[PDB]
């Protein structure tokens, strides 16, 4: 009944921090990410991240439900908020 997304900080650097988002229940989900400030992703595996504006979005390509993203500090650190939608 309803799905969720967990993001654990895997590697942390003094310039950028990676995150590990994942959803359980189904694989066809829409992981929306709300990057704070002007954060930008420079890497993504098991999922693609795109979308213009201050908000961010993620979509599955056909692999699983566990993917990671590379956020850049750029004067920030708080990870983004993921939300599963489409179940």
UniProtKB/Swiss-Prot annotation:
Role noted for this protein: Endo-acting xylanase which displays no detectable activity against polysaccharides other than xylan. Hydrolyzes glucosidic bonds with retention of anomeric configuration.
Organism: Cellulomonas fimi
Family to which the UniProt record says this protein belongs: Belongs to the glycosyl hydrolase 11 (cellulase G) family.
Identification of the protein by name: Bifunctional xylanase/deacetylase
Domain CBM2: 1-87
Domain of life: Bacteria
């Amino acid at each position: 009944t309803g799905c969720s997304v967990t993001a654990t900080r895997a590697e942390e650097w003094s310039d950028r921090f990676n995150v590990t988002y994942s959803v359980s229940g189904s694989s066809a989900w829409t992981v929306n990410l709300a990057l704070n400030g002007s954060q930008t992703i420079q890497a993504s595996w098991n999922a693609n991240v795109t979308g213009s504006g201050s908000t961010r979005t993620v979509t599955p390509n056909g692999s699983g439900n566990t993917f990671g993203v590379t956020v850049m500090k750029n004067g920030s650190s708080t990870t983004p908020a993921a939300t599963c939608a489409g179940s």
